[PDB]
Amino acid sequence: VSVALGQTVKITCQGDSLRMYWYQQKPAQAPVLYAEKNRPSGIPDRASLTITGAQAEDEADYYCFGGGTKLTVLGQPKAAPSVTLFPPSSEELQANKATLVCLISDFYPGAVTVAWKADSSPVKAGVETTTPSKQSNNKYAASSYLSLTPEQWKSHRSYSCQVTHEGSTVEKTVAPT
Amino acid sequence: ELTQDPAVSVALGQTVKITCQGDSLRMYYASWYQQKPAQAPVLVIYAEKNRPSGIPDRFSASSSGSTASLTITGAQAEDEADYYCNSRDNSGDHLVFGGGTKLTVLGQPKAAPSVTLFPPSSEELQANKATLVCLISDFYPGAVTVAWKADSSPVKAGVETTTPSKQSNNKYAASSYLSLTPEQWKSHRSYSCQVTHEGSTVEKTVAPT
């Protein structure tokens, strides 16, 4: 969930007990403070939460308990990820190893979801994905990798890496030889 | 309205006690949350005595007066996180939270990084691109220095390296990539990725085929 500076956002909470009947948590900080119509005090003033005037400091997790909503305050333009799926190299295959690397770069905001496929079959066994971190251009980079045996690599028609980034999905597919 | 030290350390397999202090703790039992970077908080203990399903038996909680404590016996590598206490706050149906305590688990087994260097893929060369990727995995502690080479010449421009993050095995992973044009890739005899991890340096080399 992202918003531009000075723009309007809506964070939504879904589940039971909402038919019958606010905490802000910045990274490595305590979730600080009621129910739809209430007047709090201590932090600057103005189920779903709406923020009319958004500042870079407002970038935090909001909780109604909900799973958590990472509100991103756009400090720069949105950028879809550049996705490159690298197949196992000849050198790695000659060493009886196979690793596929899905390189994800130049994206903003810094949140992605990665899914893998063996042919048309979704796979998650042997998958590791790194936490996005800032490049020198202030955009983000991450990598997801899938460890396979060379027999698994050669016995499949293809392998795919799918990257989801705020309503955009980029899938890259590679095939042996 | 609850106080706890910002950080604490323990040795692997040893016991750690994280304490919270506040007037509300004399009236209410504390709940404990575990939070790792880029992850949703996990309820580790509910109102001192309830351990939810999925939470290891290593976690327990106790209290005395205006203090509440979370005890981790036989602290594991997966237990490194920020631990926050929470409770109700006297006259008023609202919750108060502690500032959080970051836990460091010392004496964890060290590991040299596994380094895999990929040449440009056939799809990116067909698209007039020649980015190389250097996968750095299964290392501990989570700090590396990455340097690239064009034959024997060090490369500064076009290099990006990710901050190491934990894998599901509690070892770290990172990647470094070098953006090149097919021209730069084909003109050199080889390119290298050298990774420095404490007393170890691992370098891999790829060549155009």
Residue numbers in the entry:
A (entry chain A): 10 to 30, 34 to 45, 48 to 60, 70 to 87, 99 to 211
B (entry chain B): 3 to 211
Lines quoted from the article behind this entry:
However, low Tmapp values do not correlate perfectly with LCs amyloidogenicity, since M7 and M10 LCs unfold at temperatures close to those of the most stable H LCs. However, M7 was found present at high concentration in vivo, and yet no aggregation or toxicity was observed at presentation and during the later follow-up times. Inspection of the SDS-PAGE gels shows that the proteolysis pattern is different in different H LCs, suggesting that the sequence of proteolytic events, and not only their kinetics, may be characteristic of each H LC. It is also remarkable that fold stability and kinetics of proteolysis do not necessarily correlate: M7 displays the lowest Tmapp among the M LCs, but also very slow proteolysis kinetics; H3, H6 and H9 show relatively high Tmapp, within the H group, but are almost instantly proteolysed by trypsin. With the only exception of one of the two VL domains of the M7 LC dimer, the two β-sheets building the VL domains are in general easily traceable; however the quality of the electron density for the CDR loops is markedly dependent on the LC crystal structure considered. In H6 and M8 dimers all six CDRs (three for each LC monomer) are traceable in the electron density; in H9 and H10 five out of six are traceable, in H7 three, and in H3 and M7 only two CRDs are traceable. In some cases (H6, H9, H10) CDR3 (residues 89–97) participates in the interface; both CDR3s in the H7 dimer lack electron density, while in M7 and M8 CDR3 residues are located far from the VL–VL interface. In the structures of all H LCs and in M7, the association interface is roughly symmetric, and is located on the five-stranded beta sheet (strands 1, 3, 4, 7, 8), where the 3, 4, 7, 8 strands establish the intermolecular contacts.
